[PDB]
Ligand binder design. Sequence first.
Ligand SMILES: *N(C(=O)N[C@H]1CCN(c2cc(O[C@@H](C)[C@@H]3CCCN3C)nc(-c3noc([C@@]4(C)CCCc5sc(N)c(C#N)c54)n3)n2)C1)C1(COC)CC1
Ligand SMILES: Nc1nc2c(ncn2[C@@H]2O[C@H](COP(=O)(O)OP(=O)(O)O)[C@@H](O)[C@H]2O)c(=O)[nH]1
Ligand SMILES: [Mg+2]
Length: 169
Amino acid sequence: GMTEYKLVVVGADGVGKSALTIQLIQNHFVDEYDPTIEDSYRKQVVIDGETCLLDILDTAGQEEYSAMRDQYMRTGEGFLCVFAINNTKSFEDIHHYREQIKRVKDSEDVPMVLVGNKSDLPSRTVDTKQAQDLARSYGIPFIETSAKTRQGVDDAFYTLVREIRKHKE
Ligand SMILES: *N(C(=O)N[C@H]1CCN(c2cc(O[C@@H](C)[C@@H]3CCCN3C)nc(-c3noc([C@@]4(C)CCCc5sc(N)c(C#N)c54)n3)n2)C1)C1(COC)CC1
Ligand SMILES: Nc1nc2c(ncn2[C@@H]2O[C@H](COP(=O)(O)OP(=O)(O)O)[C@@H](O)[C@H]2O)c(=O)[nH]1
Ligand SMILES: [Mg+2]
C-alpha cells in the first residue's frame, strides 16, 4: 500500500506558506495566492526510493482556538513552522505555533521542521545562526527555503516525512 503523510504548513501571514506548497504541488512559483484560501493539496512523490502520497494543508484561516479548528489541525502528522528571513515578527511568533501544535497533538514529540523562507532576498533581518539555534533548542531540523527559486522545497517537505517515519518507528 502507498503510505499517505498528512503535512500541515503553519506560520505568520505572508511568510510564503502558499508559495512553498504550490512549488511542491505545481513546480511553479506563484507570487500571488489569495491569503485567505486554506486548502489541502495531494502529490505523489518518491522519497528515499519509496513512493508515497503527500497531503499538504496550507493554513490561512482566522486565529481560532475552538474544538473544530483544533481537530482539523490534529489531523496533521507533521508540521512545517515557517517564518520569513526578512520578517523578525514571523520568527518571534514561531514558539507560539510550536506550542499550539504540541497542545493539539497532546505530545511533546510532534514531527516538525523549522523553515526560514524568502532566502533569495537580500534584506535579511534574522541571522541563520539564530534560526539554527532555535531549531537546536527544540531538537528539530532547520531548512532554508525560497519558494521563488525552489531552494530547499523538497528538503523541507521530505525532511518532515523522514521525521514522521522516525516517530512512527
Ligand atoms: N494576516 C493575519 O493576521 N492572519 C491571521 C490568521 C492566522 N493568524 C494567527 C495569529 C496568531 O497569533 C499568535 C502568534 C498570537 C499569540 C497570542 C495570540 N495571538 C494574537 N496565531 C495564529 C496561530 N497560532 O496557531 C495557529 C494554528 C493554525 C497552528 C497549528 C496548531 C493550531 S491549533 C489551532 N486552534 C490553531 C489556530 N488558530 C493552530 N494559528 N494564527 C493571524 C495578516 C496579513 O496582512 C498583511 C492580516 C495580518
Ligand atoms: N522573494 C520571495 N517572495 C516570496 C517567497 N515566498 C513567498 N513570497 C512572497 O511573499 C508574499 C506572501 O506569500 P504567500 O505565499 O501568500 O504567503 P502565506 O500568507 O504564508 O501563504 C507574496 O507577495 C509572495 O510573492 C520567497 O521565497 N521569496
Ligand atoms: Mg496563503
